Structure 1
Protein backbone atom coordinates (compact mmCIF):
# COMPACT_ATOMS: atom_id res chain seq x y z
CA UNK A 1 0.00 0.00 0.00
CA UNK A 2 1.02 3.67 -0.26
CA UNK A 3 2.40 4.87 3.12
CA UNK A 4 5.56 6.69 4.34
CA UNK A 5 8.57 4.46 5.18
CA UNK A 6 8.76 5.62 8.83
CA UNK A 7 5.37 4.08 9.54
CA UNK A 8 6.49 0.87 7.81
CA UNK A 9 9.32 0.65 10.37
CA UNK A 10 6.95 1.16 13.33
CA UNK A 11 4.95 -1.87 12.20
CA UNK A 12 7.73 -4.13 11.00
CA UNK A 13 9.65 -3.40 14.21
CA UNK A 14 6.70 -3.98 16.52
CA UNK A 15 5.79 -7.17 14.73
CA UNK A 16 9.35 -8.46 15.06
CA UNK A 17 9.74 -7.81 18.79
CA UNK A 18 6.26 -9.10 19.61
CA UNK A 19 6.01 -11.89 17.06
CA UNK A 20 2.27 -11.26 17.04
CA UNK A 21 -0.02 -8.36 16.07
CA UNK A 22 -3.77 -7.74 16.37
CA UNK A 23 -6.22 -5.30 14.79
CA UNK A 24 -10.00 -4.84 14.83
CA UNK A 25 -11.54 -4.83 11.30
CA UNK A 26 -12.13 -1.11 11.26
CA UNK A 27 -10.36 1.04 8.76
CA UNK A 28 -10.74 4.78 9.69
CA UNK A 29 -9.12 4.46 13.13
CA UNK A 30 -6.06 6.60 12.29
CA UNK A 31 -4.31 5.16 15.39
CA UNK A 32 -4.71 1.65 16.71
CA UNK A 33 -4.05 0.19 20.18
CA UNK A 34 -0.28 0.15 20.67
CA UNK A 35 1.40 0.78 17.22
CA UNK A 36 1.45 4.55 16.49
CA UNK A 37 0.19 4.37 12.89
CA UNK A 38 -3.17 4.53 11.15
CA UNK A 39 -5.07 1.29 11.54
CA UNK A 40 -5.51 1.05 7.80
CA UNK A 41 -1.73 1.29 7.58
CA UNK A 42 -1.39 -1.63 9.96
CA UNK A 43 -3.79 -4.05 8.32
CA UNK A 44 -2.73 -3.68 4.69
CA UNK A 45 0.93 -3.84 5.70
CA UNK A 46 0.60 -7.31 7.08
CA UNK A 47 -1.91 -8.24 4.37
CA UNK A 48 1.06 -7.77 2.04
CA UNK A 49 3.52 -9.32 4.47
CA UNK A 50 1.16 -12.25 4.40
CA UNK A 51 0.41 -12.51 0.69
CA UNK A 52 4.15 -12.90 0.11
CA UNK A 53 4.31 -15.68 2.70
CA UNK A 54 6.21 -14.59 5.80
CA UNK A 55 3.15 -14.28 8.12
CA UNK A 56 -0.28 -15.90 8.54
CA UNK A 57 -3.65 -14.11 8.97
CA UNK A 58 -6.78 -15.20 10.86
CA UNK A 59 -10.18 -13.52 11.22
CA UNK A 60 -13.06 -14.62 13.53
CA UNK A 61 -15.45 -12.13 15.21
CA UNK A 62 -13.92 -9.15 13.36
CA UNK A 63 -10.31 -8.89 14.57
CA UNK A 64 -7.41 -10.04 12.26
CA UNK A 65 -5.04 -12.28 14.28
CA UNK A 66 -1.52 -11.97 12.84
CA UNK A 67 0.97 -14.85 13.29
CA UNK A 68 4.52 -14.30 12.00
CA UNK A 69 6.20 -17.34 10.36
CA UNK A 70 9.80 -18.59 10.38
CA UNK A 71 10.15 -17.52 6.75
CA UNK A 72 9.07 -14.01 7.70
CA UNK A 73 11.32 -14.16 10.74
CA UNK A 74 14.26 -14.19 8.37
CA UNK A 75 12.63 -11.45 6.32
CA UNK A 76 12.29 -8.95 9.18
CA UNK A 77 15.76 -10.11 10.16
CA UNK A 78 16.62 -8.49 6.83
CA UNK A 79 14.48 -5.32 6.97
CA UNK A 80 15.69 -4.22 10.36
CA UNK A 81 19.20 -5.31 9.28
CA UNK A 82 19.55 -6.96 12.67
CA UNK A 83 21.88 -10.05 12.93
CA UNK A 84 20.98 -13.75 12.70
CA UNK A 85 20.04 -14.90 16.21
CA UNK A 86 18.42 -11.52 16.95
CA UNK A 87 15.06 -12.00 18.73
CA UNK A 88 11.24 -12.15 18.25
CA UNK A 89 8.62 -13.61 20.65
CA UNK A 90 10.83 -16.64 21.10
CA UNK A 91 12.21 -16.13 24.61
CA UNK A 92 10.90 -18.25 27.51
CA UNK A 93 10.19 -14.99 29.42
CA UNK A 94 11.83 -14.96 32.87
CA UNK A 95 11.34 -18.31 34.59
CA UNK A 96 7.76 -18.16 33.27
Structure 2
Protein backbone atom coordinates (compact mmCIF):
# COMPACT_ATOMS: atom_id res chain seq x y z
CA UNK A 1 0.00 0.00 0.00
CA UNK A 2 1.12 3.55 -0.82
CA UNK A 3 0.76 5.61 2.37
CA UNK A 4 2.55 8.96 2.77
CA UNK A 5 5.14 8.81 5.52
CA UNK A 6 3.40 11.56 7.47
CA UNK A 7 -0.05 9.93 7.32
CA UNK A 8 1.48 6.59 8.30
CA UNK A 9 3.01 8.41 11.26
CA UNK A 10 -0.34 9.53 12.67
CA UNK A 11 -1.43 5.90 12.34
CA UNK A 12 1.49 4.92 14.55
CA UNK A 13 0.94 7.41 17.35
CA UNK A 14 -2.69 6.32 17.58
CA UNK A 15 -1.85 2.63 17.77
CA UNK A 16 0.50 3.74 20.54
CA UNK A 17 -0.89 5.74 23.48
CA UNK A 18 -4.27 4.02 23.43
CA UNK A 19 -2.63 0.96 21.89
CA UNK A 20 -5.95 -0.26 20.50
CA UNK A 21 -7.62 0.95 17.30
CA UNK A 22 -11.18 0.39 16.02
CA UNK A 23 -12.00 0.84 12.32
CA UNK A 24 -15.33 0.36 10.55
CA UNK A 25 -15.15 -1.73 7.36
CA UNK A 26 -15.72 0.88 4.65
CA UNK A 27 -12.83 1.55 2.31
CA UNK A 28 -14.05 4.87 0.90
CA UNK A 29 -14.72 6.59 4.25
CA UNK A 30 -12.98 10.02 4.25
CA UNK A 31 -12.02 10.03 7.97
CA UNK A 32 -11.90 7.16 10.49
CA UNK A 33 -12.85 9.91 13.11
CA UNK A 34 -9.74 9.19 15.19
CA UNK A 35 -6.75 9.25 12.77
CA UNK A 36 -6.83 12.24 10.44
CA UNK A 37 -6.20 10.20 7.30
CA UNK A 38 -8.16 7.87 5.02
CA UNK A 39 -9.98 4.98 6.70
CA UNK A 40 -8.60 2.57 4.10
CA UNK A 41 -5.10 3.63 5.13
CA UNK A 42 -5.82 2.59 8.72
CA UNK A 43 -7.01 -0.86 7.66
CA UNK A 44 -4.10 -1.54 5.31
CA UNK A 45 -1.43 -0.02 7.56
CA UNK A 46 -2.49 -2.26 10.44
CA UNK A 47 -2.95 -5.21 8.11
CA UNK A 48 0.83 -5.08 7.68
CA UNK A 49 1.37 -4.81 11.43
CA UNK A 50 -0.78 -7.86 12.09
CA UNK A 51 1.00 -9.43 9.11
CA UNK A 52 4.31 -8.94 10.97
CA UNK A 53 3.13 -10.08 14.39
CA UNK A 54 2.83 -6.71 16.09
CA UNK A 55 -0.95 -6.50 16.62
CA UNK A 56 -3.74 -9.02 17.07
CA UNK A 57 -6.71 -8.45 14.79
CA UNK A 58 -10.29 -9.45 15.62
CA UNK A 59 -13.30 -8.98 13.34
CA UNK A 60 -16.92 -8.89 14.50
CA UNK A 61 -20.01 -7.25 13.00
CA UNK A 62 -18.17 -5.49 10.15
CA UNK A 63 -15.72 -3.85 12.57
CA UNK A 64 -11.98 -4.21 13.11
CA UNK A 65 -10.61 -4.57 16.65
CA UNK A 66 -6.84 -3.97 16.60
CA UNK A 67 -4.82 -4.51 19.78
CA UNK A 68 -1.07 -3.89 20.19
CA UNK A 69 1.22 -6.77 21.14
CA UNK A 70 3.91 -6.36 23.76
CA UNK A 71 6.34 -7.18 20.97
CA UNK A 72 4.87 -4.30 19.00
CA UNK A 73 5.63 -1.75 21.70
CA UNK A 74 9.35 -2.46 21.18
CA UNK A 75 8.98 -1.99 17.41
CA UNK A 76 7.58 1.50 17.85
CA UNK A 77 10.19 2.07 20.56
CA UNK A 78 12.95 2.02 17.93
CA UNK A 79 11.37 2.84 14.56
CA UNK A 80 9.58 5.96 15.86
CA UNK A 81 12.91 7.00 17.50
CA UNK A 82 10.80 7.85 20.59
CA UNK A 83 12.10 8.06 24.19
CA UNK A 84 12.45 4.68 25.94
CA UNK A 85 9.67 5.63 28.36
CA UNK A 86 7.16 2.95 27.44
CA UNK A 87 3.64 1.80 28.42
CA UNK A 88 1.24 3.44 25.88
CA UNK A 89 -1.91 3.67 27.89
CA UNK A 90 -3.49 0.18 27.97
CA UNK A 91 -0.15 -1.06 29.40
CA UNK A 92 0.19 1.69 32.05
CA UNK A 93 -0.58 -0.94 34.75
CA UNK A 94 -3.76 0.76 35.89
CA UNK A 95 -4.43 -2.66 37.54
CA UNK A 96 -7.88 -4.33 37.64
CA UNK A 97 -10.57 -4.33 40.34
CA UNK A 98 -11.97 -7.09 42.53
> TM-score when scaled to structure 1?
0.90
Q: Which has the higher helix share?
A: 1
Higher strand share: 2
Q: May I ask how many residue pairs the two structures share in their alignment?
A: 93
Aligned to 1:25: 25
CA contact (8 A) 2:73 2:86 kept: no
Measure, in 2, the Cα distance between the counterparts of 1:78 and 1:18: 18
Q: TM-score, length-normalised on structure 2?
A: 0.88
Unpaired runs of at least 5, structure 1: none
Deviation at 1:83, TM superposition (A): 2.7
CA RMSD of aligned residues (A): 1.4
SS in 2 for 1:17: coil
Q: How far apart, in 2, do the equivalents of 1:87 and 1:81 lie? A: 15
Counterparts of 2:31 and 2:5 in 1: how far apart (Å)?
16
